[PDB]
Amino acid sequence: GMTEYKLVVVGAAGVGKSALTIQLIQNHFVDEYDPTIEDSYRKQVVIDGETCLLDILDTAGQEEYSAMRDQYMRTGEGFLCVFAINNTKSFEDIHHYREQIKRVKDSEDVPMVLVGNKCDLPSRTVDTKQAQDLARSYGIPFIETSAKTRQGVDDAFYTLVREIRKHKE
Amino acid sequence: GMTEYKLVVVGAAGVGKSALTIQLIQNHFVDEYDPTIEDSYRKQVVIDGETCLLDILDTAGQEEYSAMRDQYMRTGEGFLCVFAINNTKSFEDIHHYREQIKRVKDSEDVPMVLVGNKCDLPSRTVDTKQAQDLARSYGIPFIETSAKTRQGVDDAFYTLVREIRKHK
Amino acid sequence: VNPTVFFDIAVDGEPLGRVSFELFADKVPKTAENFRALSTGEKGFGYKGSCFHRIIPGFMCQGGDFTRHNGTGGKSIYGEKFEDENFILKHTGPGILSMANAGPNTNGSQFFICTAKTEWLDGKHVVFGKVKEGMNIVEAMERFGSRNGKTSKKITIADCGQL
Amino acid sequence: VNPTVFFDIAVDGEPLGRVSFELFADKVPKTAENFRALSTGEKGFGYKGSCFHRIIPGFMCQGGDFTRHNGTGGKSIYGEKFEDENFILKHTGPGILSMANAGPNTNGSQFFICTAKTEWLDGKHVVFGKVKEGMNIVEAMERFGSRNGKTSKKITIADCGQL
Ligand SMILES: CCn1c(-c2cc(N3CCN(C4CC4)CC3)cnc2[C@H](C)OC)c2c3cc(ccc31)-c1csc(n1)C[C@H](NC(=O)[C@H]1[C@@H]3COC[C@@H]31)C(=O)N1CCC[C@H](N1)C(=O)OCC(C)(C)C2
Ligand SMILES: CCn1c(-c2cc(N3CCN(C4CC4)CC3)cnc2[C@H](C)OC)c2c3cc(ccc31)-c1csc(n1)C[C@H](NC(=O)[C@H]1[C@@H]3COC[C@@H]31)C(=O)N1CCC[C@H](N1)C(=O)OCC(C)(C)C2
Ligand SMILES: Nc1nc2c(ncn2[C@@H]2O[C@H](COP(=O)(O)OP(=O)(O)O)[C@@H](O)[C@H]2O)c(=O)[nH]1
Ligand SMILES: Nc1nc2c(ncn2[C@@H]2O[C@H](COP(=O)(O)OP(=O)(O)O)[C@@H](O)[C@H]2O)c(=O)[nH]1
Numbered sequence: 285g286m287t288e289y290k291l292v293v294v295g296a297a298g299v300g301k302s303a304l305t306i307q308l309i310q311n312h313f314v315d316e317y318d319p320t321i322e323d324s325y326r327k328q329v330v331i332d333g334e335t336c337l338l339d340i341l342d343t344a345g346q347e348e349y350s351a352m353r354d355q356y357m358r359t360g361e362g363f364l365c366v367f368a369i370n371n372t373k374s375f376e377d378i379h380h381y382r383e384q385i386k387r388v389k390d391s392e393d394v395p396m397v398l399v400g401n402k403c404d405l406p407s408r409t410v411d412t413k414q415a416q417d418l419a420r421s422y423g424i425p426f427i428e429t430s431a432k433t434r435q436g437v438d439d440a441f442y443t444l445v446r447e448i449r450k451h452k453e
Numbered sequence: 454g455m456t457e458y459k460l461v462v463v464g465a466a467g468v469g470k471s472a473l474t475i476q477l478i479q480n481h482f483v484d485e486y487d488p489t490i491e492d493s494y495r496k497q498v499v500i501d502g503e504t505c506l507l508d509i510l511d512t513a514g515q516e517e518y519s520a521m522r523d524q525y526m527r528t529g530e531g532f533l534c535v536f537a538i539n540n541t542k543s544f545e546d547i548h549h550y551r552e553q554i555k556r557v558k559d560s561e562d563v564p565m566v567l568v569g570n571k572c573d574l575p576s577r578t579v580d581t582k583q584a585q586d587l588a589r590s591y592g593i594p595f596i597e598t599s600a601k602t603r604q605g606v607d608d609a610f611y612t613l614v615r616e617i618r619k620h621k
Numbered sequence: 622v623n624p625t626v627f628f629d630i631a632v633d634g635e636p637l638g639r640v641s642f643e644l645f646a647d648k649v650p651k652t653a654e655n656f657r658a659l660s661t662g663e664k665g666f667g668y669k670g671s672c673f674h675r676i677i678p679g680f681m682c683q684g685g686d687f688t689r690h691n692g693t694g695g696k697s698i699y700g701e702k703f704e705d706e707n708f709i710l711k712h713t714g715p716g717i718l719s720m721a722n723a724g725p726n727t728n729g730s731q732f733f734i735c736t737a738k739t740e741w742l743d744g745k746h747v748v749f750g751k752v753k754e755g756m757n758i759v760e761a762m763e764r765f766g767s768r769n770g771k772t773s774k775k776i777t778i779a780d781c782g783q784l
Numbered sequence: 785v786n787p788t789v790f791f792d793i794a795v796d797g798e799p800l801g802r803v804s805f806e807l808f809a810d811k812v813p814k815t816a817e818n819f820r821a822l823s824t825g826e827k828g829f830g831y832k833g834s835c836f837h838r839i840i841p842g843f844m845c846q847g848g849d850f851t852r853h854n855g856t857g858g859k860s861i862y863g864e865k866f867e868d869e870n871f872i873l874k875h876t877g878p879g880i881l882s883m884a885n886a887g888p889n890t891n892g893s894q895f896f897i898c899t900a901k902t903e904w905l906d907g908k909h910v911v912f913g914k915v916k917e918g919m920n921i922v923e924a925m926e927r928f929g930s931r932n933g934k935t936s937k938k939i940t941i942a943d944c945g946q947l
């Protein structure tokens with residue numbers, strides 16, 4: 285029986301959480317904006333030769349509901365913290381998500397991956413260096429992605445699974 | 454805002470867990486057998502003058518998966534423990550559901566209601582006195598239902614809400 | 622005088638009933654007029670045939686996407702989107718009719734009908750009407766919603782117009 | 785000798801691709817023949833036009849209800865139901881083709897295609913074939929499943945037959 289990994293995709297509204305997740309699950313790019321309330325997805329994959337089952341929670345970044353994130357943070361095993369490289373505000377929101385996840389898990393050691401999305405777009409406002417530094421300070425990987433081109437999409441989710449496997453041995 | 458109550462319908466396969474739940478939510482009787490994998494429903498209702506939101510988990514009674522119940526038992530607030538009046542085995546299985554809920558939740562007073570369904574049928578094999586006694590032990594209500602006639606459907610779910618209220 | 626419009630609701634093409642709305646032209650004339658004209662279809666397009674794509678019991682019923690029929694579209698009679706007229710009126714309880722949006726000044730055609738008080742939407746969504754008859758039709762639509770809003774049957778505006 | 789049949793899968797009417805199956809008539813002749821004749825429709829009824837009503841990623845894809853089209857129906861070429869022929873073959877890994885049922889000796893037309901080993905079904909469901917070509921199509925079908933198996937797009941057997 286294959287292992288299941290409970291991944292949660294978090295970040296500010298419109299950074300591309302659903303676009304990234306739908307690319308992973310359905311090999312389709314959602315061009316339109318269909319804001320999420322809450323969705324769940326499943327996909328079986330081979331990572332480092334080991335078949336496993338990804339259970340993905342796709343969350344809502346609307347700030348009015350920021351106090352309702354505790355339940356999904358308690359249940360999640362690993363967190364994809366997504367911002368958009370052309371939206372400095374979403375990059376500033378990351379710190380909030382990380383602190384919130386650490387608080388809820390009451391742990392300094394929570395599997396996370398920092399994801400800078402929309403790297404296909406020319407209007408970059410968040411330097412790659414600046415995102416790398418933040419990830420280094422947190423001790424987590426950083427991957428630039430494009431849900432439109434699929435760049436880094438598999439890598440982001442697979443790396444998060446590797447982070448979980450390291451916290452589990 | 455209105456209070457949310459997380460209800461879980463448990464019991465052996467085929468006892469009518471979905472028939473009762475679909476009657477509550479959609480006001481019709483499913484006469485065909487569509488065994489459940491897992492389903493969730495939402496309904497706002499007024500119980501004793503308080504508006505509230507019912508979150509209902511409809512579970513699978515297949516014994517192959519009896520070791521996989523702990524998680525939904527931990528997350529649930531109250532449990533509708535269903536057997537069928539014409540199925541002795543299902544009444545026997547009810548005991549293990551109770552013990553498993555108490556075990557998982559580590560408490561004798563988990564909000565819980567015993568439901569004897571299919572009460573419209575002839576050839577009952579589990580009469581009301583032993584169900585009543587079983588309910589007297591445990592210390593929980595017992596309601597006879599028929600998802601075909603809709604008898605006791607509202608009472609069963611509303612009584613379970615009243616038990617969560619008494620606890621919390 | 623504030624105009625009155627109606628929706629004839631059907632479920633999987635089977636008639637359910639009629640709901641009617643007062644539109645508060647006295648307080649939000651531009652937003653009421655948009656909904657009114659979309660209800661009559663007089664601009665060549667409007668709500669007729671569209672569906673309620675998001676129904677969440679305990680909160681609201683949302684619809685109005687007649688351009689894409691997938692929850693992302695819709696347009697106003699003033700162009701694709703128009704500005705927030707005002708936030709005078711509040712989401713005070715069941716039956717309030719209010720504009721959906723994707724942030725400030727992005728009103729189109731999508732709307733929602735409250736089935737409960739939703740005060741945390743005050744000041745962010747433009748309230749412009751209320752159910753006048755047929756609230757029980759709206760309540761009946763709830764039983765086809767779910768936690769994340771996906772519907773289990775097709776809830777359509779089979780007909781609509783002005784009274 | 786074991787026959788080979790095929791399904792042409794569509795997604796909301798759009799062609800996806802072909803899955804072919806070897807039917808193990810050399811071990812379960814009655815069960816293999818049922819699925820074969822239902823795939824050709826040579827008896828007047830069968831799988832053509834039916835949907836995959838339950839797709840659970842990590843486990844299996846289930847279909848075969850061409851009588852009620854709601855996941856509860858189906859029939860065999862021998863009558864409403866026929867007995868479990870034997871449990872010689874096991875649910876050993878992806879691609880296994882096996883009979884759905886509602887208990888002992890209730891085989892009809894419903895079947896499932898495993899995308900992983902499902903050894904806890906051994907001795908309870910009759911294994912009678914395996915995917916020969918088009919396992920990538922079965923995997924692609926998983927794009928539109930969910931945890932409880934409800935599909936997000938209509939997955940049909942647009943055509944089917946023997947090779
Ligand atoms: C965290 C979960 N969660 C909840 C929520 C919240 C609560 N409460 C909050 C209030 N507390 C009280 C003070 C104590 C108690 C806890 C309980 N349970 C839930 C749900 C059921 O848990 C799964 C919500 C909610 C809403 C969003 C995202 C997540 C949400 C969200 C995303 S986008 C949007 N909201 C605005 C949206 N925009 C578009 O659709 C755009 C599309 C593209 O451009 C045109 C078109 C829009 O205008 N509307 C029109 C108006 C209602 C609104 N949709 C909507 O659906 O809200 C639903 C809901 C249930 C009211 C809120
Ligand atoms: C507890 C959750 N849960 C799981 C399950 C289990 C696991 N594993 C279990 C095993 N562990 C390893 C050894 C340790 C690891 C954890 C993980 N996650 C899950 C899911 C996703 O959590 C929501 C299942 C499962 C199955 C049932 C009910 C609940 C289930 C169920 C109901 S009826 C049936 N099964 C037989 C059914 N009958 C009809 O459809 C009848 C209809 C009427 O008459 C004609 C027609 C039938 O024949 N099939 C054809 C064959 C596969 C089968 N359906 C089916 O769908 O199973 C799906 C699934 C996911 C494979 C099993
Ligand atoms: N160019 C580009 N657009 C994207 C990308 N990811 C998402 N989008 C767009 O950004 C908008 C918001 O995406 P969405 O996934 O709904 O945001 P969410 O709230 O984080 O789920 C959509 O119109 C998407 O098409 C991307 O990698 N590149
Ligand atoms: N006569 C009668 N039949 C019922 C009743 N409730 C359920 N059934 C039948 O029992 C079968 C199993 O019902 P179902 O809800 O699917 O069982 P579940 O596995 O517990 O969900 C169905 O054919 C139902 O029609 C009832 O109150 N009376």
Ligand SMILES: [Mg+2]
Pocket residue numbers: 301302303318319320342343
């Ligand atoms: Mg989203």
Ligand SMILES: [Mg+2]
Pocket residue numbers: 470471472487488489511512513
């Ligand atoms: Mg059921």
